[PDB]
PDB file of C-alpha atoms in Angstrom:
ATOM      1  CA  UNK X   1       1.156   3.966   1.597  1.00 12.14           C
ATOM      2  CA  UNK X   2      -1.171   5.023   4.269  1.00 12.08           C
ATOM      3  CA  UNK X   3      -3.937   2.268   5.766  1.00 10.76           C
ATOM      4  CA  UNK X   4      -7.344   3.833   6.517  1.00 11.90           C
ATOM      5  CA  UNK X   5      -8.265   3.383   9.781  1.00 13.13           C
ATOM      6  CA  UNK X   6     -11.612   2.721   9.926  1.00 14.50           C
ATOM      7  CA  UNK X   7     -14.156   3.425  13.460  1.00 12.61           C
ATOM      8  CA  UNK X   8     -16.984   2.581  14.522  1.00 11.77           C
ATOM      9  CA  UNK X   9     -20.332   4.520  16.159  1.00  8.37           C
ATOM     10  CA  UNK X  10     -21.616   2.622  19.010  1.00  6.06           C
ATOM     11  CA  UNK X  11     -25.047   4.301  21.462  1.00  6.01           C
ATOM     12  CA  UNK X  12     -25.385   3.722  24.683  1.00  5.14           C
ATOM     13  CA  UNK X  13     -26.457   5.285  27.921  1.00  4.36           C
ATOM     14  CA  UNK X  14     -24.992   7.691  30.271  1.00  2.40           C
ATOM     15  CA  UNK X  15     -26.225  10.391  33.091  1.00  2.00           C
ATOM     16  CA  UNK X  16     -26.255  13.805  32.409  1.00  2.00           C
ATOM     17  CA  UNK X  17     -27.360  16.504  34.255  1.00  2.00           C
ATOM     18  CA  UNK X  18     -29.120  20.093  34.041  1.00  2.00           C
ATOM     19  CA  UNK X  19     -28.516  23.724  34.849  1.00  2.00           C
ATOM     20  CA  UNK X  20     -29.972  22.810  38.575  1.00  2.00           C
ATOM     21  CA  UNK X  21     -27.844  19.777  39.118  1.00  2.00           C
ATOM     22  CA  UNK X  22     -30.611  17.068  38.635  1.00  2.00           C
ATOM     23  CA  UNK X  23     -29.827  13.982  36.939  1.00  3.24           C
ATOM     24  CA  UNK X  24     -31.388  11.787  34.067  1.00  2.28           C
ATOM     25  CA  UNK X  25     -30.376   9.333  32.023  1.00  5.17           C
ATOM     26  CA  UNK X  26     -29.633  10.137  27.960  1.00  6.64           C
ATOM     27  CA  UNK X  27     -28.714   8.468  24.742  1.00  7.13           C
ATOM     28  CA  UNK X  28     -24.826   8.649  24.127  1.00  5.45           C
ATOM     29  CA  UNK X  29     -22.846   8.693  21.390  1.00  2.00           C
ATOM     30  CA  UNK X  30     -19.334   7.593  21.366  1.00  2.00           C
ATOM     31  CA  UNK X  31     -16.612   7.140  18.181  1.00  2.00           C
ATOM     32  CA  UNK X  32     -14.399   3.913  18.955  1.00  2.00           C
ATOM     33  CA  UNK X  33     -11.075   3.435  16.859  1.00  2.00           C
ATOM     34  CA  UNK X  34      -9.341   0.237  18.493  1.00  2.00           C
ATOM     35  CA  UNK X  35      -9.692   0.251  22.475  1.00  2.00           C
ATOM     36  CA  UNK X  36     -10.589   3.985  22.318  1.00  2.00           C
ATOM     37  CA  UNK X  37     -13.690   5.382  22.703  1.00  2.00           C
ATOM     38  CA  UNK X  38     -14.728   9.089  22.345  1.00  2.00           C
ATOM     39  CA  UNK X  39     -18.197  10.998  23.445  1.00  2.00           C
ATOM     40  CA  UNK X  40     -18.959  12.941  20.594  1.00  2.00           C
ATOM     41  CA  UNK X  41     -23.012  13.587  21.128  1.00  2.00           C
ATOM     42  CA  UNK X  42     -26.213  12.726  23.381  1.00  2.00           C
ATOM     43  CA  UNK X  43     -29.998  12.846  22.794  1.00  2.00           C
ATOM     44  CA  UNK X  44     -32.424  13.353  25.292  1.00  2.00           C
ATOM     45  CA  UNK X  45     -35.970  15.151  25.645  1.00  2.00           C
ATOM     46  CA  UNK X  46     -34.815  17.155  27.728  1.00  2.00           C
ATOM     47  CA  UNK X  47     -33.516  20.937  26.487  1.00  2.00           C
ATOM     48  CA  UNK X  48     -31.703  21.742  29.402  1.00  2.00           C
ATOM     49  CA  UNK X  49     -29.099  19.656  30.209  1.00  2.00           C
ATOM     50  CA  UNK X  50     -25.198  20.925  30.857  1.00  2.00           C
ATOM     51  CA  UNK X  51     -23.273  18.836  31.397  1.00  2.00           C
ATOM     52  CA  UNK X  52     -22.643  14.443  30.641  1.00  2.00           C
ATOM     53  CA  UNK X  53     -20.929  11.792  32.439  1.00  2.00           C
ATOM     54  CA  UNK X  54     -18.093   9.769  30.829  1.00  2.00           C
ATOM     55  CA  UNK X  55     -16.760   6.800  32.534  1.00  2.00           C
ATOM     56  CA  UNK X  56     -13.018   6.171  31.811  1.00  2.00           C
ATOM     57  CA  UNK X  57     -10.178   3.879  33.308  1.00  2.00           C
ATOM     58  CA  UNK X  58      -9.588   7.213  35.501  1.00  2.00           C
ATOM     59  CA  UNK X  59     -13.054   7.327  37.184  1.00  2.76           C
ATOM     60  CA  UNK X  60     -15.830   9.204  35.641  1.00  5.08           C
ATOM     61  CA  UNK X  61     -15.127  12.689  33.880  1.00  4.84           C
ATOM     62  CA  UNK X  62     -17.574  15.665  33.701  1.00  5.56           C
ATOM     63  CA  UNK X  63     -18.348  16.932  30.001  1.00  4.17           C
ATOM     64  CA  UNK X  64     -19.983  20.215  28.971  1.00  6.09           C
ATOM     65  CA  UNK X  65     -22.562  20.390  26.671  1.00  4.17           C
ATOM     66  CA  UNK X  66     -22.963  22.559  23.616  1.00  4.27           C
ATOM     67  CA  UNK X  67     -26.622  23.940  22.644  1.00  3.99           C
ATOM     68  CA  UNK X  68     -29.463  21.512  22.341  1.00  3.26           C
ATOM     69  CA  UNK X  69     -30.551  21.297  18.362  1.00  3.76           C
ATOM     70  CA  UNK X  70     -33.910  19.928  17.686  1.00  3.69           C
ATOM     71  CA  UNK X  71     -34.691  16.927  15.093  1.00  5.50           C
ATOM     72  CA  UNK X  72     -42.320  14.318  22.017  1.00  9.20           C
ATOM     73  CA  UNK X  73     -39.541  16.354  21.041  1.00  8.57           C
ATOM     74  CA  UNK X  74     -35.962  15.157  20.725  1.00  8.43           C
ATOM     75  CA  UNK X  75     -32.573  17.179  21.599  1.00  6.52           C
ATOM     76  CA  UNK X  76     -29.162  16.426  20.418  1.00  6.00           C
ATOM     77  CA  UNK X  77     -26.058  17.879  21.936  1.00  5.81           C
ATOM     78  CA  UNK X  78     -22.690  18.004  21.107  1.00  6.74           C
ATOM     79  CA  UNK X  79     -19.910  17.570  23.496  1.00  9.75           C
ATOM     80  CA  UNK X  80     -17.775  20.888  23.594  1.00 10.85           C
ATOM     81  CA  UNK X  81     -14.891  20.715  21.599  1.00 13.38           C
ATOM     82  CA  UNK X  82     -15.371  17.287  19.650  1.00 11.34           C
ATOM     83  CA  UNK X  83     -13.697  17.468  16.622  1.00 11.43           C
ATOM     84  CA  UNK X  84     -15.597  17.886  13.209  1.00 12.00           C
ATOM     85  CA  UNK X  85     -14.858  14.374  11.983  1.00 11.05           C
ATOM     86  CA  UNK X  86     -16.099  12.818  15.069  1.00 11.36           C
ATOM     87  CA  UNK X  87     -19.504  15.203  14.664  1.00 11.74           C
ATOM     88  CA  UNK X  88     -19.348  14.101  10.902  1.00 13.05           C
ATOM     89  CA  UNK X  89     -19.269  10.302  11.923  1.00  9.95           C
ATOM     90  CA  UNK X  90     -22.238  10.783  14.569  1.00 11.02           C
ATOM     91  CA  UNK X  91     -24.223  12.544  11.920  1.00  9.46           C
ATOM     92  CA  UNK X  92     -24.083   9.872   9.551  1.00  8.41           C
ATOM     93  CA  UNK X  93     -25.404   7.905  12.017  1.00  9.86           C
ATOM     94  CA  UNK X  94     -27.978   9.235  13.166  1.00 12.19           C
ATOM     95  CA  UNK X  95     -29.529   9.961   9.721  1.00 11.65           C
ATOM     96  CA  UNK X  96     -28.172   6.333   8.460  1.00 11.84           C
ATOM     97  CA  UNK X  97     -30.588   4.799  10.848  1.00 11.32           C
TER      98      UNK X  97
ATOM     99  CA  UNK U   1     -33.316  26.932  18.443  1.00 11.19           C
ATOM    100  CA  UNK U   2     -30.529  26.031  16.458  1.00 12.64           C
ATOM    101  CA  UNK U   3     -32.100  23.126  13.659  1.00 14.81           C
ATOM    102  CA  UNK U   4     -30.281  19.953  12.616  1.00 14.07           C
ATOM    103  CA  UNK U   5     -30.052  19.416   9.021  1.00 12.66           C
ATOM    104  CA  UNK U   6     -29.446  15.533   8.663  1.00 11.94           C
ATOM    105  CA  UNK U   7     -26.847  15.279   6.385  1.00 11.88           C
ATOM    106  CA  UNK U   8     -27.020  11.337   3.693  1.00  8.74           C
ATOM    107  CA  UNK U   9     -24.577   9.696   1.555  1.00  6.65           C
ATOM    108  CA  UNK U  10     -24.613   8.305  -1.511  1.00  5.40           C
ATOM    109  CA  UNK U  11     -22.886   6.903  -4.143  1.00  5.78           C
ATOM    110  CA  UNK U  12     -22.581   6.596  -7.935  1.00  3.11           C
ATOM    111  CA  UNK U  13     -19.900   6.893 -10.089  1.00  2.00           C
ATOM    112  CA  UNK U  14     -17.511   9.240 -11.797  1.00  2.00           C
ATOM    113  CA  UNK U  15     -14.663   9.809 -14.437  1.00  2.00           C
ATOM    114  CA  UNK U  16     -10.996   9.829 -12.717  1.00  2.00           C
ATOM    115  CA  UNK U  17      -7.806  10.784 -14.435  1.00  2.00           C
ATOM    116  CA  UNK U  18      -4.518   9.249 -13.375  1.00  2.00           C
ATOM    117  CA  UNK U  19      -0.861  11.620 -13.527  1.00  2.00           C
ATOM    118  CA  UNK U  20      -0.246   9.766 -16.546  1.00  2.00           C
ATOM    119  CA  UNK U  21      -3.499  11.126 -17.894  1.00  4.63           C
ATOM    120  CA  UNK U  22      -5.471   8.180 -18.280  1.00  2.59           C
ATOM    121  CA  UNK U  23      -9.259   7.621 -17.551  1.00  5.22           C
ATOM    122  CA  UNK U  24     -11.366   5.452 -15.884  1.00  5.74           C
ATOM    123  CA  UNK U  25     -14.564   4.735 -13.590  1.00  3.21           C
ATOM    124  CA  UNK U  26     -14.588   5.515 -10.220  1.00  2.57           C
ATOM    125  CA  UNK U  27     -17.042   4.944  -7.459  1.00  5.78           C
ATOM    126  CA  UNK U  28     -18.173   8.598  -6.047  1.00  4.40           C
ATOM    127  CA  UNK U  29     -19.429   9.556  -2.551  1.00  3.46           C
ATOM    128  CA  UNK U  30     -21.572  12.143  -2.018  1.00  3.12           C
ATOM    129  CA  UNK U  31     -22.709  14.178   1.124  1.00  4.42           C
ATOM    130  CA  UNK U  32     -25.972  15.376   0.289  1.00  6.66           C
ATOM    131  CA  UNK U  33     -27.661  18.285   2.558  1.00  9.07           C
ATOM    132  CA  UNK U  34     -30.802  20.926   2.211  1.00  5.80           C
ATOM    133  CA  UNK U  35     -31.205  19.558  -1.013  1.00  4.34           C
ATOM    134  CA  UNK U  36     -27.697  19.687  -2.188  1.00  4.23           C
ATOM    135  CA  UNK U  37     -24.738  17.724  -3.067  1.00  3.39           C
ATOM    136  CA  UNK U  38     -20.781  17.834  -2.481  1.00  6.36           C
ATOM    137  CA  UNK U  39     -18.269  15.273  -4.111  1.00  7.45           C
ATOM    138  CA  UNK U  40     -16.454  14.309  -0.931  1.00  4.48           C
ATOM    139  CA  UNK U  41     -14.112  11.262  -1.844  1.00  2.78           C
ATOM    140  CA  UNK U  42     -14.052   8.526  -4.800  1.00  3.31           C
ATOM    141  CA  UNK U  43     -12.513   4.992  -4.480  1.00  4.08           C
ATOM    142  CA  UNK U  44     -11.041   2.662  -6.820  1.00  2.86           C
ATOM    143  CA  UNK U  45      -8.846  -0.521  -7.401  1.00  5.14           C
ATOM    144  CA  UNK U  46      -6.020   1.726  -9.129  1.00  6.03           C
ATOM    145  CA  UNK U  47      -3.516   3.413  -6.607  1.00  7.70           C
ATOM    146  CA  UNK U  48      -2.241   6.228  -9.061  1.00  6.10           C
ATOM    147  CA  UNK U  49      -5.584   8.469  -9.569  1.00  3.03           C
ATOM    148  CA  UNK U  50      -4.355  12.331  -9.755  1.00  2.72           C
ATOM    149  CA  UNK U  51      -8.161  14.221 -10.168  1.00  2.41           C
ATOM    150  CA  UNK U  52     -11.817  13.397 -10.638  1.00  3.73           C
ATOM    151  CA  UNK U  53     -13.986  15.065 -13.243  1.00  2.21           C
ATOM    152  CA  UNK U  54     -16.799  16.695 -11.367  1.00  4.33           C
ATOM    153  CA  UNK U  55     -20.235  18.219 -12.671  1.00  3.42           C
ATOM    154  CA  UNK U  56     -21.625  20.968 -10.675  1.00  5.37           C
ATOM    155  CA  UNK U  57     -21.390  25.807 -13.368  1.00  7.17           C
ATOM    156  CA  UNK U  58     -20.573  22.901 -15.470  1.00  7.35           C
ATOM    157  CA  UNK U  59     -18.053  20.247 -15.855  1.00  9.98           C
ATOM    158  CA  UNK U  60     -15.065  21.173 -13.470  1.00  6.25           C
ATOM    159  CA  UNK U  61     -11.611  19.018 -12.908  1.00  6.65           C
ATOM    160  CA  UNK U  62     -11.303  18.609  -8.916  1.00  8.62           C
ATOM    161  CA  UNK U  63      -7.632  17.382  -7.427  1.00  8.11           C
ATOM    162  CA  UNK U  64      -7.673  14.019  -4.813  1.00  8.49           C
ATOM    163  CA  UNK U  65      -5.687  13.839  -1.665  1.00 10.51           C
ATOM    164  CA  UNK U  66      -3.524  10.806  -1.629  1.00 12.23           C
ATOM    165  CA  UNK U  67      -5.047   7.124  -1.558  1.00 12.08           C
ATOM    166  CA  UNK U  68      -5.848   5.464   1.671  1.00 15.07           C
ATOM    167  CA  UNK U  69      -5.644   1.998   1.709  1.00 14.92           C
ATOM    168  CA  UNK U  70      -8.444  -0.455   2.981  1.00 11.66           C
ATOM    169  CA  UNK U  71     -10.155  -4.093   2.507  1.00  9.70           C
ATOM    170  CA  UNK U  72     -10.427 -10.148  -0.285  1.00 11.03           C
ATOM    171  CA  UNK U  73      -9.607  -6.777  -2.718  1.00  8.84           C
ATOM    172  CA  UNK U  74      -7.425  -3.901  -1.846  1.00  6.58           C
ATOM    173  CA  UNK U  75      -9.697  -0.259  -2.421  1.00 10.33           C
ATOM    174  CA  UNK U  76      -8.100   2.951  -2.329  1.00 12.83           C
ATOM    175  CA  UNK U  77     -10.031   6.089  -0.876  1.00 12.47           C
ATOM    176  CA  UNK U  78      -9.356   9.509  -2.268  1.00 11.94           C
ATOM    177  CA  UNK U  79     -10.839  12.418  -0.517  1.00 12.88           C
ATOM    178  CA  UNK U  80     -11.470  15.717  -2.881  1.00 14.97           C
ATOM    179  CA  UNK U  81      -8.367  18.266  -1.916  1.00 16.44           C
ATOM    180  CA  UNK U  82      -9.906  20.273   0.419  1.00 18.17           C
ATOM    181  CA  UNK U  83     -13.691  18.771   1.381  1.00 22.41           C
ATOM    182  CA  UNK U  84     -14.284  19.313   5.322  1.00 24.41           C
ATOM    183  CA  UNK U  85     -13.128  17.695   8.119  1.00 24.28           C
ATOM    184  CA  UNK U  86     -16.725  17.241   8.813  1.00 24.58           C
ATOM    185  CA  UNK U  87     -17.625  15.791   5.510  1.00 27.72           C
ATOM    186  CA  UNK U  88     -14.580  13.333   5.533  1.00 30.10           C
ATOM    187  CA  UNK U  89     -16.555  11.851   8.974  1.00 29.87           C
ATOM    188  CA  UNK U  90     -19.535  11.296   7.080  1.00 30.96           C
ATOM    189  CA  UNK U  91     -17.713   9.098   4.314  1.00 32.93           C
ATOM    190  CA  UNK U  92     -15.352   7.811   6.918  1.00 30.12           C
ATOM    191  CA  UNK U  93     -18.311   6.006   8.879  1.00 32.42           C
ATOM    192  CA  UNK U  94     -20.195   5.073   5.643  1.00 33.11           C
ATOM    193  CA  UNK U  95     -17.546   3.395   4.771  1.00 32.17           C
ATOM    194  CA  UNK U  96     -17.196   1.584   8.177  1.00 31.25           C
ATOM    195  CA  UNK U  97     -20.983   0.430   8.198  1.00 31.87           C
ATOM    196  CA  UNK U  98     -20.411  -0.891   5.128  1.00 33.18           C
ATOM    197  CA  UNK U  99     -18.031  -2.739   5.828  1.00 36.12           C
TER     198      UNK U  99
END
Protein backbone atom coordinates (compact mmCIF):
# COMPACT_ATOMS: atom_id res chain seq x y z
CA UNK A 1 0.00 0.00 0.00
CA UNK A 2 1.56 3.16 -1.11
CA UNK A 3 -0.72 6.66 -1.12
CA UNK A 4 0.02 8.91 -4.13
CA UNK A 5 1.01 12.04 -3.16
CA UNK A 6 -0.37 14.36 -5.26
CA UNK A 7 1.26 18.39 -5.98
CA UNK A 8 0.32 21.12 -7.19
CA UNK A 9 1.83 23.91 -9.96
CA UNK A 10 1.32 27.31 -8.71
CA UNK A 11 2.99 30.83 -11.05
CA UNK A 12 4.01 33.60 -9.61
CA UNK A 13 6.61 36.30 -9.79
CA UNK A 14 10.15 36.57 -8.89
CA UNK A 15 13.44 38.77 -9.94
CA UNK A 16 15.92 37.42 -11.99
CA UNK A 17 18.76 38.81 -13.37
CA UNK A 18 21.14 38.82 -16.59
CA UNK A 19 24.71 38.15 -17.62
CA UNK A 20 25.40 42.07 -16.62
CA UNK A 21 23.74 41.95 -13.27
CA UNK A 22 20.51 43.94 -14.17
CA UNK A 23 17.34 42.96 -12.77
CA UNK A 24 13.68 42.30 -14.07
CA UNK A 25 10.92 40.76 -12.97
CA UNK A 26 9.78 37.05 -14.59
CA UNK A 27 7.06 34.49 -14.46
CA UNK A 28 7.96 31.61 -11.92
CA UNK A 29 7.18 28.33 -11.66
CA UNK A 30 7.21 26.45 -8.50
CA UNK A 31 6.00 22.51 -7.63
CA UNK A 32 4.32 22.55 -4.01
CA UNK A 33 3.79 19.07 -2.20
CA UNK A 34 2.42 20.04 1.41
CA UNK A 35 4.30 23.25 2.88
CA UNK A 36 7.07 22.74 0.26
CA UNK A 37 7.57 24.57 -2.59
CA UNK A 38 10.18 24.01 -5.39
CA UNK A 39 11.36 26.47 -8.47
CA UNK A 40 11.35 24.30 -11.26
CA UNK A 41 11.04 27.01 -14.37
CA UNK A 42 10.58 30.87 -15.34
CA UNK A 43 9.36 32.71 -18.48
CA UNK A 44 10.36 35.94 -19.45
CA UNK A 45 11.05 37.91 -22.85
CA UNK A 46 14.05 38.27 -22.10
CA UNK A 47 16.92 35.60 -23.58
CA UNK A 48 19.51 36.49 -21.36
CA UNK A 49 18.89 36.04 -18.02
CA UNK A 50 21.32 33.83 -15.47
CA UNK A 51 20.38 33.59 -12.75
CA UNK A 52 16.55 33.73 -10.39
CA UNK A 53 15.72 34.70 -6.99
CA UNK A 54 14.02 32.27 -4.55
CA UNK A 55 12.77 33.49 -1.32
CA UNK A 56 12.91 30.82 1.47
CA UNK A 57 12.52 30.79 5.40
CA UNK A 58 16.52 31.25 5.11
CA UNK A 59 16.51 34.60 3.20
CA UNK A 60 16.54 34.66 -0.49
CA UNK A 61 18.74 32.03 -2.49
CA UNK A 62 20.45 32.64 -5.89
CA UNK A 63 19.46 30.01 -8.72
CA UNK A 64 21.22 29.41 -12.05
CA UNK A 65 19.53 29.21 -15.06
CA UNK A 66 19.70 26.61 -17.78
CA UNK A 67 19.37 27.76 -21.63
CA UNK A 68 16.44 29.87 -22.65
CA UNK A 69 14.00 27.59 -25.09
CA UNK A 70 11.63 29.47 -27.19
CA UNK A 71 7.66 28.75 -27.39
CA UNK A 72 6.85 39.26 -28.74
CA UNK A 73 8.81 36.32 -28.12
CA UNK A 74 8.63 34.20 -24.99
CA UNK A 75 11.65 32.29 -23.10
CA UNK A 76 11.37 29.51 -20.70
CA UNK A 77 14.16 28.40 -18.46
CA UNK A 78 14.77 25.69 -16.37
CA UNK A 79 16.35 25.91 -13.04
CA UNK A 80 19.71 23.85 -13.08
CA UNK A 81 19.37 20.64 -11.71
CA UNK A 82 15.44 20.32 -11.19
CA UNK A 83 14.55 16.98 -11.35
CA UNK A 84 12.69 15.46 -14.46
CA UNK A 85 9.39 14.97 -12.67
CA UNK A 86 9.29 18.43 -11.47
CA UNK A 87 10.14 19.61 -15.39
CA UNK A 88 7.41 16.96 -16.35
CA UNK A 89 4.80 18.63 -13.93
CA UNK A 90 5.70 22.31 -15.23
CA UNK A 91 5.31 21.08 -18.75
CA UNK A 92 1.97 19.88 -18.33
CA UNK A 93 1.20 23.03 -17.25
CA UNK A 94 2.17 25.13 -19.34
CA UNK A 95 0.65 23.30 -22.36
CA UNK A 96 -2.61 22.44 -20.07
CA UNK A 97 -3.35 26.09 -20.05
CA UNK B 1 17.95 27.93 -29.96
CA UNK B 2 16.98 24.96 -28.29
CA UNK B 3 12.77 24.54 -29.21
CA UNK B 4 10.13 23.44 -26.71
CA UNK B 5 7.97 20.73 -27.83
CA UNK B 6 4.75 21.06 -25.57
CA UNK B 7 4.12 17.83 -24.50
CA UNK B 8 -0.51 16.89 -23.81
CA UNK B 9 -2.26 14.21 -22.09
CA UNK B 10 -4.94 12.27 -22.75
CA UNK B 11 -6.93 9.59 -21.90
CA UNK B 12 -8.97 6.63 -23.17
CA UNK B 13 -9.06 3.30 -22.26
CA UNK B 14 -7.32 -0.03 -22.41
CA UNK B 15 -7.38 -3.89 -21.72
CA UNK B 16 -5.52 -4.84 -18.25
CA UNK B 17 -4.72 -8.31 -17.10
CA UNK B 18 -4.57 -9.13 -13.41
CA UNK B 19 -1.70 -12.07 -11.95
CA UNK B 20 -4.55 -14.25 -11.87
CA UNK B 21 -4.98 -13.63 -15.57
CA UNK B 22 -8.14 -11.98 -15.72
CA UNK B 23 -9.26 -8.98 -17.94
CA UNK B 24 -10.80 -5.90 -17.69
CA UNK B 25 -11.13 -2.05 -18.72
CA UNK B 26 -8.83 0.31 -17.66
CA UNK B 27 -8.60 4.02 -18.00
CA UNK B 28 -5.19 4.86 -20.07
CA UNK B 29 -3.01 8.02 -19.97
CA UNK B 30 -1.19 9.08 -22.64
CA UNK B 31 1.73 11.62 -23.15
CA UNK B 32 1.42 12.68 -26.55
CA UNK B 33 4.49 14.69 -28.29
CA UNK B 34 5.65 15.68 -32.12
CA UNK B 35 2.82 13.84 -33.13
CA UNK B 36 3.29 10.79 -31.09
CA UNK B 37 2.04 8.82 -28.28
CA UNK B 38 3.49 6.82 -25.13
CA UNK B 39 1.25 4.71 -22.67
CA UNK B 40 2.52 6.23 -19.45
CA UNK B 41 0.19 4.88 -16.56
CA UNK B 42 -3.52 3.31 -16.42
CA UNK B 43 -5.86 3.50 -13.35
CA UNK B 44 -8.54 1.42 -12.10
CA UNK B 45 -10.86 0.44 -9.11
CA UNK B 46 -9.10 -3.14 -8.89
CA UNK B 47 -5.78 -3.19 -6.77
CA UNK B 48 -4.32 -6.52 -8.31
CA UNK B 49 -3.62 -5.43 -12.16
CA UNK B 50 -0.19 -7.28 -13.27
CA UNK B 51 0.13 -5.75 -17.24
CA UNK B 52 -1.77 -3.67 -19.76
CA UNK B 53 -2.27 -4.72 -23.35
CA UNK B 54 -0.76 -2.01 -25.45
CA UNK B 55 -1.08 -1.28 -29.35
CA UNK B 56 1.80 0.39 -30.91
CA UNK B 57 4.54 -3.00 -34.35
CA UNK B 58 1.32 -4.35 -33.19
CA UNK B 59 -0.38 -5.51 -30.13
CA UNK B 60 2.37 -5.77 -27.34
CA UNK B 61 1.81 -6.91 -23.43
CA UNK B 62 3.52 -3.99 -21.26
CA UNK B 63 4.24 -4.80 -17.25
CA UNK B 64 2.74 -1.96 -14.45
CA UNK B 65 4.69 -0.76 -11.51
CA UNK B 66 2.79 -1.29 -8.35
CA UNK B 67 -0.63 0.61 -7.59
CA UNK B 68 -0.63 3.95 -5.94
CA UNK B 69 -3.41 4.72 -4.02
CA UNK B 70 -5.57 8.00 -4.32
CA UNK B 71 -9.27 9.59 -3.96
CA UNK B 72 -15.73 9.17 -2.33
CA UNK B 73 -13.92 6.00 -4.47
CA UNK B 74 -10.53 4.60 -3.92
CA UNK B 75 -8.42 4.64 -7.70
CA UNK B 76 -5.29 2.94 -8.10
CA UNK B 77 -2.50 4.42 -10.49
CA UNK B 78 -0.18 2.11 -12.32
CA UNK B 79 2.69 3.60 -14.13
CA UNK B 80 4.07 1.38 -17.29
CA UNK B 81 7.50 -0.42 -15.85
CA UNK B 82 9.89 1.77 -16.99
CA UNK B 83 8.10 5.18 -18.64
CA UNK B 84 10.33 8.37 -17.64
CA UNK B 85 10.69 10.17 -14.74
CA UNK B 86 9.68 13.00 -16.89
CA UNK B 87 6.61 11.43 -18.27
CA UNK B 88 5.42 10.20 -14.75
CA UNK B 89 5.36 14.37 -13.97
CA UNK B 90 3.15 14.89 -16.74
CA UNK B 91 0.47 12.25 -15.47
CA UNK B 92 1.33 13.10 -11.93
CA UNK B 93 0.01 16.83 -12.37
CA UNK B 94 -2.87 15.77 -14.71
CA UNK B 95 -3.97 13.92 -12.27
CA UNK B 96 -3.69 16.73 -9.61
CA UNK B 97 -5.66 19.34 -11.84
CA UNK B 98 -8.11 17.01 -12.08
CA UNK B 99 -8.65 16.55 -9.07
Amino acid sequence: NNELCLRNVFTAQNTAQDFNGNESTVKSFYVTRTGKKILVAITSTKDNLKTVTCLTETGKTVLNLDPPMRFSVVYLYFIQNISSLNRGMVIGHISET
